[PDB]
Paper text:
To investigate the photophysics of special pairs independently of the complexities of native photosynthetic proteins, and as a first step toward creating synthetic photosystems for new energy conversion technologies, we designed C2-symmetric proteins that hold two chlorophyll molecules in closely juxtaposed arrangements. For Chl dimer protein scaffolds, we chose hyperstable C2-symmetric repeat protein dimers containing symmetric pockets with tunable sizes and geometries. In this dimeric repeat protein architecture, the hydrophobic core is independent of the small molecule-binding site, enabling full customization for binding with little impact on the overall protein structure.
SP2 was intended to assemble a ZnPPaM dimer with a conformation substantially different from that of native special pairs to investigate the effect of dimer geometry. The SP2 crystal structure was solved in both the apo state and the ZnPPaM-bound state to 2.4 and 2.5 Å resolution, respectively. The apo- and holo-state amino acid backbones both agree with the SP2 design model to within 1.4 Å r.m.s.d. The holo-state crystal structure has two copies of the SP2 dimer in the asymmetric unit; alignment of the two ZnPPaM dimers shows that their binding geometries are equivalent, with an r.m.s.d of 0.22 Å over the tetrapyrrole rings. Despite the accuracy of the protein backbone design, the crystal structure shows that the ZnPPaM molecules are rotated and translated relative to the design model (3.5 Å r.m.s.d. across tetrapyrrole ring atoms). Compared with the apo-state crystal structure, the SP2 binding cavity widens by ~1.6 Å in the presence of ZnPPaM; this expansion provides the extra volume needed for the ZnPPaM molecules to adopt their unexpected conformation. While the ZnPPaM dimer in SP2 differs from the design model, the crystal structure nevertheless satisfies the objective of creating a non-native dimer geometry. The experimental SP2−ZnPPaM absorption features at 668 and 690 nm correspond to a Qy peak splitting of 477 cm−1 (a coupling of 239 cm−1), which is consistent with the calculated value.
Residue numbers in the entry:
A (entry chain B): 0 to 244
B (entry chain A): 1 to 244
Write the structure that this text describes.
């Protein structure tokens, strides 16, 4: 599709420009962005003279990577000097560069699989990092982000051991749970002195603690249902607090 | 299959959160229940039929669930604003046609329709969020409702068959409404801080220029300026949040 290709490359170039600005002076980040910008050029040349279908796959792959380096650049900014998050970023960066190298050397299905995981991990570390920021000085919210980060550490080691689906599922849990923490920390600031809104936020927070613990206990169907509900309720209460003033 | 179980797990969460965000709205609940139905059939076909058809059917359901989650979010954030309500119902309508196209059989046309609907669903939710973060700011509310007009232009361009021009326009809508949201959140976090306020003002002026350039038809340059603005809005929203 010649007009669809132009559209996907437009998005890829936006993500790449933004990632490069977000990456600032970080060498690993700048290197990944530069590597991916070069890969977009290779998809465009392939489009300009070669096989449109090969360019399309090349380009769809560049798009996933650019999404991932965008998320990793955001995490690295938000994380500042937190050593655990910096260790995570560096690991995701390592995996993404290996994804690209594997893709360049022609085994595209195995690198596309790797890239899927990298993107989820990059989304996970970005919302964890943003949740740390929003939790501010609140120890209960910090303690929860600390657990959720540890679950993220486990997912990467789990993937390296070959249980891809379990690790991916664990990234999915990590992304939603740290997103709820962000929402809940936002809600408790948007509620102020209002005692109804504070109580409503506390109850939801208790539902997150329950869902995190169910997941750690291994009943995943129930824990995922609780998390999805928490997210909707945290959203609804954050919206309601925003509107009372 | 390992991928299929993880895909149904993601679709389930999106469907579960969309039900709660639907509340008692019947049009949104109709949409949720309808996508939940297709998820079950997908899982019934993986259970008692061909697994290859179930996974193409599940990947469609999963995009539908992301879309319906976005629109239900947007419907909540719209409150009683008549432009946004109207946009939401228009995307709900388009989403229903897409599902109905897939349920009949033209799966490739369902998928290209659904790809578009998911973008409009994303764009209308960020407009909605940005309108809330805009609060009582008249400058920001103008821009947001400006961006929503761009959004309405896209849906009709697409309904006329110029599919890729319209996709480019939603893309612009989403990054621009997103940038407004970031600038608004950063202004709220900065309080009265002299420098942070000046820095937010600078970014707003570059966002208006990007919008202006896009309206002139210089897409390549507007996309560059917008991608730049979004990174700069984000860095400044972080330094502000790291203050208060």
């Amino acid at each position: 599709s010649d007009e669809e290709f132009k559209f996907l490359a437009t998005e890829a170039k936006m993500l790449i420009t933004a990632a490069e600005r977000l990456a600032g002076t970080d060498p690993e980040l700048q290197e990944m962005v530069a590597l991916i910008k070069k890969e977009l050029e290779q998809a465009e040349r392939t489009f300009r003279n070669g096989d449109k279908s090969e360019a399309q796959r090349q380009l769809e792959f560049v798009l996933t990577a650019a999404r991932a380096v965008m998320n990793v650049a955001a995490a690295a900014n938000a994380a500042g000097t937190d050593p655990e998050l910096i260790e995570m970023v560096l690991r995701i960066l390592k995996q993404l560069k290996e994804a690209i190298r594997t893709f360049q050397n022609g085994d595209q299905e195995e690198a596309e699989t790797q890239l899927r995981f990298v993107l989820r991990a990059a989304i996970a570390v970005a919302v964890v990092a943003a949740a740390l920021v929003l939790a501010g000085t609140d120890p209960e919210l910090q303690e929860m982000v600390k657990q959720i980060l540890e679950e993220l550490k486990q997912a990467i080691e789990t993937f390296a051991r070959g249980d891809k689906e379990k690790a991916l599922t664990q990234l999915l849990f990590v992304a939603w749970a740290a997103h709820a923490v962000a929402m809940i920390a936002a809600a408790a600031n948007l509620a102020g002195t209002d005692p109804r809104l504070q109580q409503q936020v506390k109850e939801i927070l208790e539902k997150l603690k329950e869902a995190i613990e169910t997941f750690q206990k291994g009943d995943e169907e129930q824990a995922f249902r609780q998390l999805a509900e928490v997210l909707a309720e945290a959203a609804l209460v954050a919206l309601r607090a925003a509107l009372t003033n």
